[model samples]
Target chain A: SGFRKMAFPSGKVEGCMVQVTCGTTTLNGLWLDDVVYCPRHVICTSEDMLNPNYEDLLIRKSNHNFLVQAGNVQLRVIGHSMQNCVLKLKVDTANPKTPKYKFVRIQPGQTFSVLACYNGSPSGVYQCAMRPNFTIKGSFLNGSCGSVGFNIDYDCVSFCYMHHMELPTGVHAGTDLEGNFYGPFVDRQTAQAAGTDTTITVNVLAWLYAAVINGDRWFLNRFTTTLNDFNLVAMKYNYEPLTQDHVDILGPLSAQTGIAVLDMCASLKELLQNGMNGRTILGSALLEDEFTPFDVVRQCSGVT
Target chain B: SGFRKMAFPSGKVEGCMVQVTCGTTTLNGLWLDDVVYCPRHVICTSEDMLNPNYEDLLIRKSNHNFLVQAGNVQLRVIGHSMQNCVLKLKVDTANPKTPKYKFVRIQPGQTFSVLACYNGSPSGVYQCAMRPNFTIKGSFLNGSCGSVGFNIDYDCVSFCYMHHMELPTGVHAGTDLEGNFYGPFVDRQTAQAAGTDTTITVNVLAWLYAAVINGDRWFLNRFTTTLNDFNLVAMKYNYEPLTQDHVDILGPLSAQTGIAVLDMCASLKELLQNGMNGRTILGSALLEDEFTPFDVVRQCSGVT
Candidate 1:
């Protein structure tokens, strides 16, 4: 299981009309805490996470009387790396299990918030527990001070996101959730070679993460041509498993005759699918440096 | 010592006057081929590589007579990769070197070609020999094809242009320079779970090779971003040497914050030098990966 955001709306302690939200963002469960509320019946609404994959929903509206008065509210963002999970919010009304508020399918890179009004006081104490979808069987907790008690199956929100490859330090790679990967550097020469590896990882992961964060479509913009030669070599050598070599003899044509190509992926689904195709054609595995298998499909995991 | 390219202004080689204008396109050394002269001194030009690093000039005035009379003459493209090494191509009309062409930098991703254009008969043989920039004790080859022999110095291009790291090909890695850098995906789960280490290396190395092949400046658009990250990490860590934790923390942070902040090389360079004030930076020497320092600079080597 992973972590989830804490406070909702204003993150204020003295808010009668405030709503607090807690839930898991990845495939596994999440650790939650510090739920604030008031005595009055606070209205909370819950919905399915935007996507069945990585974190999706934005705590669209936790606006209690406290939120409208403050103009803005802050929410904490935390979650596990890979597992099924949930997000829950309780209200002052009765029948907590029926939850005045609830959220689900919160996709990766999405945020949830709670509202806190300074006019109210803390009411009751309750506990919320998170459960991992993959049988890890560890439960985490979050609670509220009202007649409210609920949980959100936020597992999908965390899984679809890409875990970046680690790069060397000092080697700043561009983020934005692009398909980049890195490894450790063994620089016996230049000192600047420190973050080389990690940079590669972050860059690749960033691309994957971006999809979750932006909730928009993006394509891989292969500006660099350096990979062409490597692919050509791979094709020429008949790298087993994948016979992507369209033209074998065309591999090492003279300088002028060779051509370069690049492709793109708009979303995580597409990215993964394309990656799968690449593996099929190349006959090689994808995500070689990744942490585990679930890292790719965690999005399709928990959240019931 | 990179690739080269040439184009006839009119696009038609027939009856067009060509010129052998000698000039260096980049810091790269030019390749020399055995020149053969026919009964007439006609225009015979060599093929130009597409290497953005360097381009040499060798223009010839079209003699109309060579193609019409001798059928065709060849403008064999020749050369090797050498960093700062100088070569003197002395054309010999009397003799010819059997296998005069030699590659200075021949790696897995490289393509070798020997262009033959028949514009006329043999012109003359050229003695191409490496000459140290300074006063060194070595016998220079005489400009006699049959009289002088041709040899290549492999380190011609040096490591300056080499990748900072090699990609992960699992078992294929560390085997040899020609080892496979792709994956060995047995199934979807395995492919998806491939670590960030292997994925990042493949991407990074791929970008590098692409840039070299197309000879386009845009190919290296992210270089500055990557370099800046390295500088920042080095300074932040104070080059004190790196640990696993250091790599984990610094690697991800730089990937997340570095590139987005410093997009240009100047900013990255400045930040690396001044921004890292009073910080003890560590290097790849302390890394757990087995990658060489150069490899580290390019990608992570340890885990792969």
Candidate 2:
């Protein structure tokens, strides 16, 4: 198993909405104090839950509410909910007039979620009540839920709904859910087409972390080019709002290429900026005591 | 000393054929003006003789017209004779219909040179005189003589052929030529070992410039990786290229790669065809705002 014994320095705490994302698929609910939710719900963290080929998700937290990891994307709840509330969430109310709020419901063990509002307002909040006389409430949280992609609908006068959608568990790169074998994908595009977006995201994230962030020049240089590949895929798929996966990948890719290209320009400038540095990239000795690669380029191109 | 002051006004130039190259083994000919050329050829000026641990060769002119530089390959009149009446030459008058004349042998000293025909046509022009026969010919300078390397045949019936040859100049990464010798390279094969055309160019140039152009990222990041490696000899041995000696060396090698590769794709498609814009390459803040390296390339790749 791809398990690396990691310590959650903050350890386990209550009322924390924790989500564990291994690669691309984000487990909807992994609340720190609750055990009712597993991606499959039936198997709750057992030997049956482990896949030997996959790596474990890195846990990150914020507020008292934590988010499940989406591939490498770790969502740390920026704002915490109120104490002991069966369900709670911190929302960035779009309108300043409405104010940010910690929306909560007194129901226990019920499906409660913070969803976005229709027509793109601050957002909406909903709690799954299992009884009669259930009422809908409104606040800034209502408008915010829709922001990150949640479908909202109307039933009667001000009726709201939220439902469970099966998120991909993992991509079997060469096979589909029914074990139908396909692709030896040439690149991310093909793989994404045949597989799922989450699969591509997962694999790419793995590549970025393994080959780019901690990869060598050989690997890093390639991954830089790979970024363009992923970006192309993302653009086609209209994958917006760069999640943590996108951000994390971009960070290292930018750092590598940025530092390199800039350094080259800087080094060349250093040579041409002033005195004859007698520096040649191949080596100082390769060039005469006075010439540099700058000179080589200038002379060969017959330009300054 | 190899010295020449150059300036960059617009900060950068575009459409500019920028080929960064290095290697040692300075040729006996290629003189800067008239001073035996230094990779750091000095007067760094003047039409006087300058010898600074470099080699020298007599100049050989074909038509009275002399061209400045022959792509990086310099031709030295390896063997000269003096039964001079007006002129003499070595021509490869290969074919009668489409004659490729190696018009050489002119004035004793007057910047002798070899120039190419403007368009692709059977070129012929000569200044060679036999016995009392003298003629200052003109058509177009054909396969006269290129300084780098061309197998001169006995016919005087000019036939031109360019081939690859290995060259490596001084590297200051460390060690002397004897202890530090490397590379008995095969020509840049038209097809790679696996019969792939892209690999050779991709690997070498990417290695050369990407490593040199955007090389620092690797070193900074990897040296962070390499901090564990004192296995340092490999470092300096690798640090070589821009040297008068190396230039002389690669004069042949690059000549080979450049000629073979450029000649391969001689298609002239200037651009996507659009308005022009001046651009400078480096700026720290260009990357920091809402943009990133990802954006830079996406704009360039023009995929999505």
- Each prediction's Cα RMSD? 27.8, 31.3
Candidate 1 error regions (>4 Å): A1-169, A173-268, A273-304, B1-30, B33-155, B158-304
DockQ of all models, two decimals each: 0.01, 0.01
Model 1 residue A266 CA deviation in Å: 7.6
Q: Which is the leading candidate under TM-score? A: 1
Question: How well is each residue in B69-184 modelled by candidate 1, as lDDT tens digits?
Answer: 11223343232221221222223221222222322332222211111111111111111111111111111111101111112222121111101111122111111111111233
Tens-place lDDT digits, model 1, residues A3-78:
1111111111112233333232111111123332221112222133112222333233233322211113433322
Interface RMSDs of all predictions? 32.4, 30.9
On residues A220-290, what C-alpha lDDT tens digit does candidate 2 reach at each position?
22222244444454455422222444345334434544533222222222322232333222111111111
DockQ of 2: 0.01
